[PDB]
Amino acid sequence: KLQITLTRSVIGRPETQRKTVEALGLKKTNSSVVVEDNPAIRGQINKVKHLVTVEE
Amino acid sequence: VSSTKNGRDSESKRLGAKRADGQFVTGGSILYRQRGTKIYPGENVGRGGDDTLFAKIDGVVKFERKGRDKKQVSVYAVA
Amino acid sequence: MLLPKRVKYRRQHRPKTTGRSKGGNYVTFGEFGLQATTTSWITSRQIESARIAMTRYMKRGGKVWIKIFPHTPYTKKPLEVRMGAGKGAVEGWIAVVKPGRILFEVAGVSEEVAREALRLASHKLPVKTKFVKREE
Amino acid sequence: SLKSIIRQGKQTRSDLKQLRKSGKVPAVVYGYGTKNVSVKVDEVEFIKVIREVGRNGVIELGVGSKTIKVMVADYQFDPLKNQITHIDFLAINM
RNA sequence: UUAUUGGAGGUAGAGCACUGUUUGGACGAGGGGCCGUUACCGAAUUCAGACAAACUCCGAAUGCCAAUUAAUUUAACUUGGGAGUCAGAACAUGGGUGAUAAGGUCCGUGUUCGAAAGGGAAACAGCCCAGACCACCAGCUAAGGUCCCAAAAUAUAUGUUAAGUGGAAAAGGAUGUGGCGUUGCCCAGACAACUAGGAUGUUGGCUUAGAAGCAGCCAUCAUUUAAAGAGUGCGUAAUAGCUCACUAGUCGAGUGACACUGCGCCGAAAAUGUACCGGGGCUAAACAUAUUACCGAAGCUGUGGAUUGUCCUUUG
RNA sequence: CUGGGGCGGUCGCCUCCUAAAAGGUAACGGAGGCGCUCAAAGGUUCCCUCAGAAUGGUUGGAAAUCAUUCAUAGAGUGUAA
RNA sequence: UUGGCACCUCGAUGUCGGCUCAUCGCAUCCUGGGGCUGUAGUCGGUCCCAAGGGUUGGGCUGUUCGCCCAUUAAAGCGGUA
RNA sequence: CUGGUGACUAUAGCAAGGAGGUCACACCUGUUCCCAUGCCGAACACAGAAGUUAAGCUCCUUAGCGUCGAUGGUAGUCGAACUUACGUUCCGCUAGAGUAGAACGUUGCCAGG
Ligand SMILES: [Mg+2]
Ligand SMILES: [Mg+2]
Ligand SMILES: [Mg+2]
Ligand SMILES: [Mg+2]
Ligand SMILES: [Mg+2]
Ligand SMILES: [Mg+2]
Ligand SMILES: [Mg+2]
Ligand SMILES: [Mg+2]
Ligand SMILES: [Mg+2]
Ligand SMILES: [Mg+2]
Ligand SMILES: [Mg+2]
Ligand SMILES: [Mg+2]
Ligand SMILES: [Mg+2]
Ligand SMILES: [Mg+2]
Ligand SMILES: [Mg+2]
Ligand SMILES: [Mg+2]
Ligand SMILES: [Mg+2]
Ligand SMILES: [Mg+2]
Ligand SMILES: [Mg+2]
Ligand SMILES: [Mg+2]
């Protein structure tokens, strides 16, 4: 299990990064999701790691 | 005084691949638009009068090596 | 004044100037060399000025090699025209120099003479330079 | 005519940069009687050994516990910085 | 959207195998001025070294097309009713053009403005943070900040700077100052200073009107040396004269050269008024590196409320 | 159309580069072509392999035609790329 | 200055020269203070500090400029739509 | 093992040296016949078996050329932070060139030995 929190805004970020933020299930700044760890999730995180904070 | 004798170009011809390796295509689908045989017709693939490569059967596209320097595209029926 | 005897295209896009010296970064013909440390266009006229300075100081005793060559034509518009209406006419010829390229090499003189000759040369060029020896 | 090196792991760009800043030269030992090994040497010690034995001289390289007789097959150099950047050691047969 | 797998394609870089461009050599099929042998060898071959938007023996990152594909996600498409729009801007970046000019101009890519309020950037559409349903004299943060204007550190530790650098600029110039290396000499007395010497063949040869160490070319040798250049500068028309290198002595501890670097200095002149920190002021209240707090938005949270949805569900 | 307008240039079609390795992509950016030709220069069957160089050979020369060898494409592909 | 660009102004931002009135910069024309000089002196040359004040009447031309006459310690160069 | 006929990016090729000939493959002997030469029985075609391993062909040796080719490092670069610097830093990907080295083929089916 991973807790992922959107710590920075999507404003001013490329649309592809906004799309990955949406796909992770994050909605508003500081929102969070709890997801099962796997390579696909890790790839989404890695794409937007400058925008999110991950806690195991 | 000053002018350019340039300023001409023809319409772009949208060449290149039209279907992906591993994609299912129906018979007759164009697979590759080209000048000359930059790619060669493989199994169940034909080459039209203008060098266009097209599928002859329904099946899966596969781009394959042809010798050392050349390549081809073939279409194989799905089981 | 160096310039190609001919080129295929007289009007060329100006060269990229970022990055480091692709090659010719070592003294390979003489004993001493002048190494560029900053980036600039280098013109045929600057090359000729620098060559004359260093050769005159060396007093024909030693041998000089010009390692760069102004392959690239650059154009300029005629004075007082508006923008547009085609590209201008060839104005001069330049070599692009990036940090590490050896501009000149010298042999057949003492190290001190080589240093002074290449100093006099360097003051003619639009780049900073350093005195270099054959590496080993 | 001897010098010791230290084995390397898997290094990032920053790792290599910090090595070269500290003053060590990355290098690879390969050739007869050995597998490829990635090592760090000290630049000053390497320069002294090269001065002693010549460009084509034989060096006794301490690679972990083992000692290998090597020759410098090639080296990479940064002439703006006057810094040896990489070394290849060719373990010669006996 | 991501992961995995497959594929098309010739960019970045790189390279010189092709097309061109190009620097030093070597060698020379053959004839000419030459008797065989001291041009051209324009041929061919060869070594080494470079250049290319319209070169390529090579060739990424990315992006793109797909998959009886997995995870997360919430769209997607068709038909029909109604539109507006067809002057775009800055910023960043890949490029053309222009002058590696323009707040220039034309394309690619991203963001923001447009149509976006709020916080920061003194003020400042386009930068940085961030997207205001309404209410609160509640809390946490972002960018940016915490001596006073002005909310929060006159915080902690270790250094750098003396230039108000910080708070505008280049080639180039400089015993400014800090760090890390290499290295010559030195109590068999180093560096500097001071005392003494600094000589002979010889006014070296040539040249010149003259050229005598010291206009210019060629050499740059010998003798006594505790050492002394066929001379480091000044001087003469040339000499003369002073001086240095070099050596010995006095003195007694450090003294030079090179390389890579941190931070400063000069180069630096414009017009209403200080006027190139927003002000005061600052030697830290500057800069570098760590650390712990706090301030800070209409972001997020807390409480109450409105409307519209979805789901449990009569209720709520 | 137009870096005001005029004047000059341009206006349809093809190829290349710009074009940022799919496709597409602008400027009065950089270079060239087209408004045809062929009765075979089309179809098909069978057969064949170039350019250049070296060395010999008459008129024949640096290059005409002949011969051997080497020669992987530097030839040719009607006509731009 | 000659231009480049086309960002404010085309439901009007009057355009050259002169006159009147100035005002500011200093890259200083004179006057003041200095270094160097191939500065004997009297004169000069060149550079540095310095903007306090001063810095002319006429001929020609719309002219600004410019040439010329006659002076002056000097007859400065520029900004202010 | 030999041949025929396939598959495979030359790791397969080139070059050099060496070995072989009831059978086979060749060179070879001829031009009556089918067939042929812009002339030529050289070639194609056919008939045939006196001669020869000389050549082709096959096999063996090697690393001179060509081919293949790491690891390590470097260039470039997606993304991020800082920046306006012909930039810096961090992460992932990661060449070309070159080095070590590989390599004088590996194989399917069929007929003979
Ligand atoms: Mg095209
Ligand atoms: Mg056709
Ligand atoms: Mg390139
Ligand atoms: Mg613009
Ligand atoms: Mg515009
Ligand atoms: Mg844009
Ligand atoms: Mg706003
Ligand atoms: Mg404000
Ligand atoms: Mg707080
Ligand atoms: Mg306060
Ligand atoms: Mg608030
Ligand atoms: Mg809110
Ligand atoms: Mg204009
Ligand atoms: Mg692309
Ligand atoms: Mg494309
Ligand atoms: Mg044809
Ligand atoms: Mg009005
Ligand atoms: Mg002044
Ligand atoms: Mg009158
Ligand atoms: Mg490689």
Curated annotation (Swiss-Prot), chain A:
SUPFAM superfamilies: Ribosomal protein L30p/L7e (SSF55129)
Keywords, ordered alphabetically: Ribonucleoprotein, Ribosomal protein
InterPro entries found in the cross-reference section: Ribo_uL30_ferredoxin-like_sf (IPR036919), Ribosomal_uL30_bac-type (IPR005996), Ribosomal_uL30_ferredoxin-like (IPR016082)
GO biological process: translation
GO CC entries: cytosolic large ribosomal subunit
Keyword NAD recorded: no
Lineage top rank: taxon: Bacteria
Pfam families registered for this protein in UniProt: Ribosomal_L30 (PF00327)
MF GO annotations: structural constituent of ribosome
UniProt key word Ribosomal protein: yes
NCBIfam families: rpmD_bact (TIGR01308)
Subunit structure: Part of the 50S ribosomal subunit.
Protein family per UniProt: Belongs to the universal ribosomal protein uL30 family.
Protein name in the entry: Large ribosomal subunit protein uL30
Species: Staphylococcus aureus (strain NCTC 8325 / PS 47)
Upper lineage: Bacteria, Bacillati, Bacillota, Bacilli, Bacillales
Swiss-Prot record, chain B:
GO cellular component: a single term: cytosolic large ribosomal subunit
Assigned keywords, A-Z: Ribonucleoprotein, Ribosomal protein
Keyword Ribosomal protein set for record: yes
Mutant lacking the gene: phenotype: Essential, it cannot be disrupted.
Superkingdom of source: Bacteria
PTM comment: The N-terminus is cleaved by ribosomal processing protease Prp. Uncleaved protein can be incorporated into pre-50S ribosome subunits. Cleavage of the N-terminus of bL27 is essential for growth; it cannot be replaced by a 'pre-cleaved' or non-cleavable form.
One BP term from GO: translation
GO MF terms, alphabetically ordered: structural constituent of ribosome
Family, as annotated: Belongs to the bacterial ribosomal protein bL27 family.
Subunit structure of this chain's protein: Part of the 50S ribosomal subunit. A mutant Prp protease unable to cleave bL27 copurifies with its substrate.
Record's protein name: Large ribosomal subunit protein bL27
Lineage of the species this protein comes from: Bacteria, Bacillati, Bacillota, Bacilli, Bacillales
Name of the coding gene: rpmA
Curated annotation (Swiss-Prot), chain C:
Organism taxonomic ancestry: Bacteria, Bacillati, Bacillota, Bacilli, Bacillales
Protein name: Large ribosomal subunit protein uL16
Membrane-spanning intervals of the chain: none
Region (Disordered): 1-23
The organism of origin for this protein: Staphylococcus aureus (strain NCTC 8325 / PS 47)
Comp. bias intervals (Basic residues): 1-19
Key words of the record: Ribonucleoprotein, Ribosomal protein, RNA-binding, rRNA-binding, tRNA-binding
Gene3D superfamilies, per the entry: Ribosomal protein L10e/L16
Protein's UniProt keywords contain Chloroplast: no
PANTHER family named in the record: 50S/60S RIBOSOMAL PROTEIN L16, LARGE RIBOSOMAL SUBUNIT PROTEIN UL16M
Subunit note: Part of the 50S ribosomal subunit.
UniProt-listed NCBIfam families: rplP_bact
